[PDB]
Design a binder for this molecule. Sequence first.
Ligand SMILES: Cc1ccc(-c2ncnc(Nc3ccc(C(=N)N)cc3Cl)c2O)cc1
Lengths: 49, 232
Amino acid sequence: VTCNIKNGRCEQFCKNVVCSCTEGYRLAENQKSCEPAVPFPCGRVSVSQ
Amino acid sequence: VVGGEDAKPGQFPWQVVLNGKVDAFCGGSIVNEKWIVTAAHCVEVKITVVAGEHNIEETEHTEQKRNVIRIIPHHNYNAAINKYNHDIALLELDEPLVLNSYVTPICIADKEYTNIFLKFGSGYVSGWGRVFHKGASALVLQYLRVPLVDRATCLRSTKFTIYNNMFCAGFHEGGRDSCQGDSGGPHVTEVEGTSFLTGIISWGEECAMKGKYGIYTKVSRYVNWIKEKTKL
Ligand SMILES: Cc1ccc(-c2ncnc(Nc3ccc(C(=N)N)cc3Cl)c2O)cc1
């Protein structure tokens, strides 16, 4: 209901709610989560650990 | 990094190492295929950057070495006044890096969210710096989770001036810390499986000494400048 409580349930960014993601990601079907929109998005480990 | 662990291949794919008069003298972070962010005191001399590095003494075929064609220290950096204040610089590479599982940028949120993520209070630092106070540098990339230290505790730890856009991180009893050679490298915060750059490894006194902490530059203070100068 508001960004000032649990970040409006947004995985990355919230705006008074409208969730958004950093470059290389798109807002998922659930309108909260962020999913890769490019082959190698920033800040993620893709080699097996 | 004193008291850290060996990073696995591709665990910190945004990490780069800088080579100059001495090899592996500072670290840096990939902003995008053409730009690295580091500390200004590191590049204050011809430099080369190596991305996709894991073990500096063994060719793993994931490395990408590039010449630096432009160095942009922040306009408020002045080493003759203070070597470690406004301590951030950008390096432009001669040819773009090829993004892959070993060479991937670090995310950078806006000013507000970079400060929110720093305030989560736990970040990861990495680099090939000294593994002991006045000791040998690492061959394999090291990493360490460091807690954020409150400003009042930070100010009491040193006689030197800690400005408001610097932060302290480390442990009350020492033993684990960043060290010389890690400078310029990243301090990142994991936000639900995506890492964001929250600090630049900057300076400190005796590495891992009880009562002393590593000092870092707040990335939130420089986000507009980083995004303006590194635009592709
Ligand atoms: C060209 C150039 C000139 C000077 C230096 C340089 N000289 C000294 N200390 C440095 N760093 C440092 C020291 C202690 C701790 C700590 N107590 N946690 C952490 C760090 Cl990052 C450093 O970056 C590097 C490159």
